[PDB]
Amino acid sequence: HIAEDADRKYEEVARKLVIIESDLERAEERAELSEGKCAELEEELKTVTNNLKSLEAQA
Amino acid sequence: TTALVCDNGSGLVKAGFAGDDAPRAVFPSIVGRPRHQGVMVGMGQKDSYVGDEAQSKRGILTLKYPIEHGIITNWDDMEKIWHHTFYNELRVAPEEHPTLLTEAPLNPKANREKMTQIMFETFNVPAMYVAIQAVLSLYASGRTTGIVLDSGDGVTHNVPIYEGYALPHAIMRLDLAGRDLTDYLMKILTERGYSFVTTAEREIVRDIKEKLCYVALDFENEMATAASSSSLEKSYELPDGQVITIGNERFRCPETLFQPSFIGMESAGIHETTYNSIMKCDIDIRKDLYANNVLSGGTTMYPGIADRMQKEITALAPSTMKIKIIAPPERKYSVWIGGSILASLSTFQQMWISKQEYDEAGPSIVHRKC
Amino acid sequence: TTALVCDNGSGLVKAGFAGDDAPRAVFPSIVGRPRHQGVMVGMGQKDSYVGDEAQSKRGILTLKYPIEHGIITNWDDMEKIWHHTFYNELRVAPEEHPTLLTEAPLNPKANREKMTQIMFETFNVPAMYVAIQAVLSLYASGRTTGIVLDSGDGVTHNVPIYEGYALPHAIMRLDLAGRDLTDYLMKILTERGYSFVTTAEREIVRDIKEKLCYVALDFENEMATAASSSSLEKSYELPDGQVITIGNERFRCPETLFQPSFIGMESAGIHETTYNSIMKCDIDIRKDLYANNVLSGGTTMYPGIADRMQKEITALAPSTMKIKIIAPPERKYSVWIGGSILASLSTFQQMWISKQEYDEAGPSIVHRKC
Amino acid sequence: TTALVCDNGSGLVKAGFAGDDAPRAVFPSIVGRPRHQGVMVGMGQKDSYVGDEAQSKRGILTLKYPIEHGIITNWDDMEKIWHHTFYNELRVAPEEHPTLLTEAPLNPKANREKMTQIMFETFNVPAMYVAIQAVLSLYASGRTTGIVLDSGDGVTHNVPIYEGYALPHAIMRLDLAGRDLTDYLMKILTERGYSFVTTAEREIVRDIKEKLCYVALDFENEMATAASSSSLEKSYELPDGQVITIGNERFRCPETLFQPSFIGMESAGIHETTYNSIMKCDIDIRKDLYANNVLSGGTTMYPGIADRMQKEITALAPSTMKIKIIAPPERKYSVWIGGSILASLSTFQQMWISKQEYDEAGPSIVHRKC
Ligand SMILES: Nc1ncnc2c1ncn2[C@@H]1O[C@H](COP(=O)(O)OP(=O)(O)O)[C@@H](O)[C@H]1O
Ligand SMILES: Nc1ncnc2c1ncn2[C@@H]1O[C@H](COP(=O)(O)OP(=O)(O)O)[C@@H](O)[C@H]1O
Ligand SMILES: Nc1ncnc2c1ncn2[C@@H]1O[C@H](COP(=O)(O)OP(=O)(O)O)[C@@H](O)[C@H]1O
Secondary structure, eight states, X not given: OHHHHHHHXXXXXXXXXXXXXXXXXXXXXXHHHHHHHHHHHHHHHHHHHHHHHHHHHHO | OOOEEEEOOSSEEEEEETTOSSOSEEEEOOEEEEOSOOOSTTSOOOSOEETTHHHHSGGGEEEXXXXXXXXXXXXXXXXXXXXXXXXIIIXXXXXXXXXXXXXXXXXXXXXXXXXXXXXXXXXXXXXXXXXXXXXXXXXXXXXSOEEEEEEOSSOEEEEEEETTEEOTTSOEEEOOOHHHHHHHHHHHGGGGTOOOOSHHHHHHHHHHHHXXXXXXXXXXXXXXXXXXXXXXXXXXXXXXXXXXXXXXHHHHTGGGGTOGGGGTOOSOOHHHHHHHHHHTSOTTTHHHHTTOEEEESGGGOSTTHHHHHHHHHHHHSOTTSOOOEEOOTTGGGHHHHHHHHHHHOGGGTTSSEEHHHHHHHOTTHHHHHO | OOOEEEEOXXXXXXXXXXXXXXXXXXXXXXXXXXXXXXOSTTSOOOSOEETTHHHHSTTXXXXXXXXXXXXXXXXXXXXXXXXXXXXXXXXXXXXXXXXXXXXXXXOOHHHHXXXXXXXXXXTOOSEEEEEEHHHXXXXXXXXXXXXXXXXXXXXXXXXXXXXXXXXXXXXXXEOOOHHHHHHHHHHHGGGGTOOOOSHHHXXXXXXXXXXXXXXXXXXXXXXHHHHHOSTTOEEEEEBTEEEEEESTHHHHTGGGGTOGGGXXXXXXXXXXXXXXXXXXXXXXXXXXXXXXXXXXXGGGXXXXXHHHHHHHHXXXXXXXXXXXEEOOTXXXXXXXXXXXXXXXOGXXXXXXXXXXXXXXXXTTHHHHHO | OOOEEEEOOSSEEEEEETTOSXXXXXXXXXXXXXXXXXXXXXXXXXXXXXXXXXXXXTTSEEEEOSBSSSXXXXXXXXXXXXXXXXXXXXXXXXGGSOEEEEEOSSOOHHHHHHHHXXXXXXXXXXXXXXXXXXXXXXXXHTOSSEEXXXXXXXXXXXXXXXXXXXXXXXXXXXXXXXXXXXXXXXXXXXXXXXXXXXXXXXXXXXXXXXXXXXXXXXXXXXXXXXXXXXXXOEEEEEBTEEEEEESTHHHHTGGGGTOGGGGTOOXXXXXXXXXXXXXXXXXXXXXXXXXXXXXXXXXXXXXXXXXXXXXHHHHHSOTTSOOOEEOOTTGGGXXXXXXXXXXXXXXXXXXXXXXXXXXXXXXXHHHHTO
8 A cells, every 4th residue: 555655656756857857957958048148148248348448439 | 759650541541650661550441330130148249340340240230431531520430440540450559659640631620620639638649740641642752843643532632742842722632532433333333233232332342443443545445345345354253152244344433533524523534633733833843743743542553544644644735745654553552651751750850749739729739830 | 362253233143253254153143932831841941042043943932133223122132142152153262352343333322332341241351342334344345445335134324435534424324124125025925825924934034035036127127027927936935845936026025125115114225325425425536436336234135236226326326437336246244354354453453442441431431432 | 876885804794885874784704514414305405505594504504704814715605605695685786886895904916806806707796996994994983094903803903094194014914803712712611611613613602702701901810800709700501501601711712812822823912013003103193193093893892902902002102192092882893884985975986996997907907006
């Protein structure tokens, strides 16, 4: 009785584990893409700051 | 000087000396009186038999319990039972031993006042004290934190305790116990043809309950299984021959603990009152209460009650907590064991109610301070 | 001989030795007392628990802060907390160490007088000194010029400094801090169904605040976004299971720092009081004040607070100045770090208030010279 | 066209027409379901009984309140109760009447959203509105300034008003009310021998509370007096004969409002939360708040509660203010009376939430605008 109890319970544990794992790797993809996005924003900001200081010296 | 521990209970007296591993005297809390005539001159018939002497002359006596639902409802019979316990079972003199009595929570004050008055006046104990059965059960379990479910013969109660602090607003007391299950079994056995109506027959049915009944992990499919095959049927032999065979009654009798609607009560099962008592406690201690459900008393001795209890509470509690039902193999004497441990402590010897304090304050000393 | 630094604060004690890089002991400034009964005889009941021992037993205790708004309002509890800090956490003898206490600006004189009297009498410190939190924060930031916004658990204050000169007429002290945000969050969570009323539940809500709350760069469109989608919802798990999920509360809680009308206060947000304290200074130093806003304290630790602060001050200041919000990653311990630096300076060893000066001058010596 | 006023409450439904002096229908907010078998073929057994029909048949029913602490926790039962209120008690058609519902302050938003959605969809009211109980109580008291203390069956709350302006940051809500006093009395009566466990027995105990309980002016010497003599003992007769007599329980039950630690709560008494709500208000209006404490609701109907309240607040407030507890003799229906007054005003007929506004904005309009 207790054996089949724990067995079904922990097979469902492996179920939520597969789900939480899928969400984990999806969040890893999210993390890497967000690093790339903030890196693109970093080059955006470096470029715009160079432009700002150059053109402000001009002004 | 050693002290006495006298866990009374509504179905079984368990007495002994503080410091032992187990009670020295365990006998039914019962007083029998003869019904029939008595014809043999010179037989020397007694007026009333107590304890297990009334259990062997069972056939000619009418048996009465002086404790109904944790409450002493016949004080002369209770005096007889205490006199027996002291002089014939323990064979001591109560004038030379402090006595530790025990009581369920949430029952009238006159009960404790009369206990104290009886002890001090008609037994001349040097001191006494009235503990709570659940606290002693926790002492015996060897922990200071947990929600103990005590279920004896008259009353079922939960007491949540944390770090040695009781939560008296979350104590929940229920009034179905071993005796109501015995009565429900006496009533449920009539649908197979067996008819027990006498008090002696009630004792027979109690023995049937203690020997053949168990708790089903899943009640519905267990019912269907018993309906399909006949592998659950066992046989019992009454004390005159006449074997009887019972089927689904085996697990329908203790199922009442989880569906008290079988006996027309409105309460919830023991699993649900345990969960409610937990959810009535402060949110920071209930995770440690969830993992220290201590079981105690005789009515918690059915095979499979811990598994069903854990299944039910697990189904109720959040899916992250670790539900642990602690069911020792000797939980029928946990109250007495804990009482002996308590009465043996050195730091307890100032908690007694001395005779002089009683002489000063009256019987009201008991709950007013101790 | 080394000296002690004892940044008290109204939510956390941070103590250590002058010369270290970080406080050696960091525990809640709290004192708990049992509210429930206590049944297990011999459990060794303590009268009161302090520090983070009272934090683990908080299920059965009633917690109290002896400091309300930077002011010590319970001197017995504060003496308990200091005794703990010296003997159990740091494990030293206060008779062998000068002590550097810390205080917020613009709070009653009796506070410092009682501080120094307590030290010199019931601890027999060889010498002591009471600094200002913002000055020490500036020491730790490695500057001599800037307007420092300190925001702890009880009080928020700005202190503008220039070349090491304070402008005491421009000091502005505000009385909403971490604790008022915790209370506002306790009140805002009720509109989702969650009810926290106990002091222990106040600690739970404080942890929710420290884990899930952030400052929105633009409050209105953030509000509309949270109303549109549900991507802002995080989930928290209380210490009994019972996952809760919060939505726009995450940024509605710390937004009170910028709109103190949410808790029914009449003041202006921290950005506006910073700008006002700047504009109360001489027109020559405020260009250097605009570029040295030094954030400090625990309440300045929300994600996105530096950017919102910069946006707001930029919108207020002239369109030519360079607003720079300096927010170190360790800014929660800047006061203690600066206090250790200060107490380690060799030129400081003449600024102590020696025991003999106190014996000559009474407790009034503290503010009268030092 | 006339409008409906439907003060719901957690223990009693009070309905009627806007413009009357008293509610037309007052019945318990309770739904009963049969508990037992049912053997008489053709009796025409109903599925469920509501209102006070479920109260006279309560011997065979299990009663359930669909509102626990001001929150509606069973929406089918609440729909049954509203259907009953409209069709059998008032005997109207909800399609022809605006409806003014009422709600306690500081409770979840889904409550009001579901209220308005239920009304507009399953009753097709032309318009509706959800007021706050304390504001209506102040309307009925004939005032525009005062701190009203409402105390019904589920929740006790203070709302301070000045000149018609609410101070939403000083609103204090507490969750002990009539029902928790009923439960505490059910628990305290067991120490005399009486055992009430059923829901019908809970109704019996509620009536005992409404008939025999009062608030002691000085709790300690009242306790000593009840201990000394026996003149405080009254007698009550259950609905089967079998009289019971209660002593100090009479004033120990409502005393819980002033010491909520009796039921294991950590909050302060109603006097202290009233004083705190006042001291949370601007220093200029609190002199006028001290003199306009308006008592409302059923739980404020104990004899001697106004005197005890005034004594306590006078002991707390400065010795120059004039504390005036305003306790009307009809204060149990103040919320409904004020609701009728409000729904009768000409300048109110633009504050309704028309069906068209709901059709445009969804159920979320109820708090977004009104
Ligand atoms: N092995 C068992 N299985 C099931 N029930 C039992 C068993 N032993 C005792 N009981 C029940 O326990 C009751 C006595 O338990 P006990 O703990 O002694 O009660 P009390 O403490 O009130 O005397 C009896 O009514 C009996 O029905
Ligand atoms: N990571 C965090 N995010 C948001 N708030 C925080 C964080 N850490 C601490 N706090 C807040 O800061 C307060 C403690 O800050 P601290 O600087 O120690 O105050 P004090 O100096 O008065 O002790 C707490 O009330 C808490 O609400
Ligand atoms: N005369 C009375 N004395 C004391 N308590 C009363 C009295 N009448 C009613 N109550 C209490 O008031 C409660 C009902 O009050 P009411 O204001 O109708 O509640 P609600 O506003 O939630 O409907 C009941 O629980 C009852 O215990």
